[PDB]
Design a protein around this ligand. Structure first.
Ligand SMILES: NC(=O)c1ccc[n+]([C@@H]2O[C@H](COP(=O)([O-])OP(=O)(O)OC[C@H]3O[C@@H](n4cnc5c(N)ncnc54)[C@H](O)[C@@H]3O)[C@@H](O)[C@H]2O)c1
Ligand SMILES: NC(=O)c1ccc[n+]([C@@H]2O[C@H](COP(=O)([O-])OP(=O)(O)OC[C@H]3O[C@@H](n4cnc5c(N)ncnc54)[C@H](O)[C@@H]3O)[C@@H](O)[C@H]2O)c1
Lengths: 329, 325
């Protein structure tokens, strides 16, 4: 038995985490605090809404008065809440400083002021390290954020490290690569590709890597870090499946029992030239974490989910996404 | 780069004041605008002697005050960011002021730069405390951070914002991380000034815990020289560690001072206190030495003698700063 406070639970990874957690732990309870902003989708958890072990609290993690009350009553806290739209972070960084930095600060304060013994897991990104042409970053390498989004995520990581040592908290930090799977919004590469291909639409590919991690595997890692991770430690999480968009697309089509005629290579486009790579040996060695699904198995499960849940993504797709020739406008 | 106008934040502080005096003294056609909120660590007397110089102007305000700082940032050619809440113990007691000044303050200044003067030369001044403890060896700019207090955590958070903003808005900015400064104008509460003052009064010397804490000691003037070098020749998006290579335990520092002052090591009495303080801090400053040719102009031996002398000759300064404690 363990009561968990999951922030940003109405989002992509948060929802997957909550469903997984309640399914694997009959006696656990979850309180989901989500502000219902960018990326949130109540539909993600509508079938669990009334499960007695689940409670939804609409609010901002930056709301100390509200957050302290929730932190006071749980055994663990899994922090997924954040603003993560890069281009949006470049236009209006304020949004990111508030949710990513102030929000994490507020959670840390509520934890050390109300319940310093609570188990805290801070979820972060592989983007904090910046790009790398060859090799992979370990948790002992410096950070080099290239956007307000990653800079604010990086800033939040630093506060967690500091508060943990200052107030002797029981907190760990996780950093993962690109997630894919159920409940990911339609314009993301993999979902967009599956949707468009099922509709016989051309899949653009600008000018012929990134590590791809099946969301459930990320979820399993977080669970492991929650129950066995050591305080004051950062844990990189990666599947070691670095592929280019063309590679991803070719595999999706194959697994959809199709041909590659849908691939339309157009002229190249800006700022998609960087490689991100995480060395996840630490978590492998210490917590024995290993991916449970291969890229093929994860994509196959992702294909099946999107084809059977048109009810979910359909309301979310616009016109850019279903457009015959989107690479033109 | 001649005729350069500078906005110095936190200029009413220990390092800030030393920096301002040095720069105005060294560059006859430069100008300085000092913005300081007059909070902890502030002392107007530090610059009372040049406060009327035509090239100097003081502005009372917080760097977190966007409307006020934006106007100053727009008209200068360089920004040296020193302002910050830098007291470790106060940060543990009440971290809020540290989040505000260190994180919010830096964020606001960064916004002023990107929006009103993206071409200004910015130097963000930070600390060796961001890397945390290290038993053996030294940290390079390529090593992870591991702040152990709210003070160093918020300073570390500020460093990260600077890196991200610089790459996002193509700014001309660098970060500096130095070790323990010592020298003229440091408050009596600090180790070296306190030891000198106590010793000059035949009073016993309070060392903390066991005084085995290891720190690199950098003469404030060598630190400002390093800052000047980074300002004028440092590369954007680069971090520069600054260390003297004078690592000593607190006990060692005290014994040195006593010897040079003519007192006995019997005045030494360890008092116990050690919450959020760390055993050893050590920075590898090879980068700045190799690229910018920076090296300490004074050894610790020469620096501590200049310091001892300054305090004995300037009681007028620390007199009203000494409390009952
Ligand atoms: N999606 C990925 O591939 C990926 C990769 C690496 C790291 N991450 C990290 O994992 C975490 C979860 O991201 P996600 O992909 O599920 O994104 P998401 O955008 O789908 O959802 C974020 C959720 O958090 C909520 N939220 C945002 N700010 C909040 C605030 N201040 N208070 C309360 N709720 C708030 C939103 O309303 C939303 O439900 C983030 O911290 C992100 O940085 C995601
Ligand atoms: N003293 C050291 O040994 C040392 C070592 C490494 C790094 N540093 C760094 O050097 C810088 C200067 O520190 P210092 O030692 O002179 O400390 P200090 O405490 O003596 O002075 C700090 C100054 O900044 C001002 N200030 C604080 N917050 C402000 C805000 N929001 N707006 C405007 N002014 C503000 C104060 O009023 C004060 O005059 C800091 O960034 C610190 O982190 C100092």
């Amino acid at each position: 038995s363990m009561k968990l406070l999951v922030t940003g639970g109405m989002g992509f990874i948060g929802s997957n985490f909550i469903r997984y957690i309640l399914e694997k732990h009959p006696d656990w309870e979850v309180i989901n605090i989500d502000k219902l902003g960018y990326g949130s989708n109540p539909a993600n958890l509508k079938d669990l809404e009334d499960d007695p072990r689940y409670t939804f609290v609409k609010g901002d993690v930056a709301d100390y008065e509200l957050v302290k009350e929730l932190v006071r009553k749980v055994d663990g806290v899994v922090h997924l809440a954040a603003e993560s739209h890069v281009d949006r972070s470049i236009s209006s960084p304020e949004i990111f400083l508030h949710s990513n930095v102030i929000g994490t600060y507020t959670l840390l304060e509520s934890i050390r002021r109300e319940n310093p013994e609570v188990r805290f897991v801070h979820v972060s990104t592989d983007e904090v390290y910046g790009d790398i042409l060859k090799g992979s970053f370990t948790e002992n390498d410096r950070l080099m954020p290239s956007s307000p989004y990653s800079a604010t995520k990086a800033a939040s990581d630093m506060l967690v490290l500091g508060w943990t040592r200052t107030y002797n908290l029981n907190a760990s930090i996780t950093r993962c690569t690109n997630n894919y799977g159920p409940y990911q919004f339609p314009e993301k590469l993999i979902p967009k590709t599956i949707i468009r291909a099922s509709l016989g639409l051309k899949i653009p590919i600008y000018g012929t890597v990134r590590d791809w991690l099946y969301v459930e595997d990320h979820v399993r890692a977080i669970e492991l870090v929650l129950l066995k991770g050591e305080s004051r430690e950062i844990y990189n999480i990666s599947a070691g499946e670095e592929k280019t968009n063309l590679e991803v697309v070719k595999i999706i089509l194959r697994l959809m029992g199709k041909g590659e005629e849908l691939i339309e290579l157009v002229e190249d486009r800006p700022g998609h030239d960087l490689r991100y790579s995480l060395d996840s040996w630490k978590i492998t060695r210490d917590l024995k974490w290993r991916p449970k699904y291969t890229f093929d198995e994860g994509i196959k499960k992702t294909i099946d989910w999107y084809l059977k849940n048109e009810w979910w993504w359909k309301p979310l797709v616009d016109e850019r996404i279903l457009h015959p020739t989107p690479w033109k406008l």
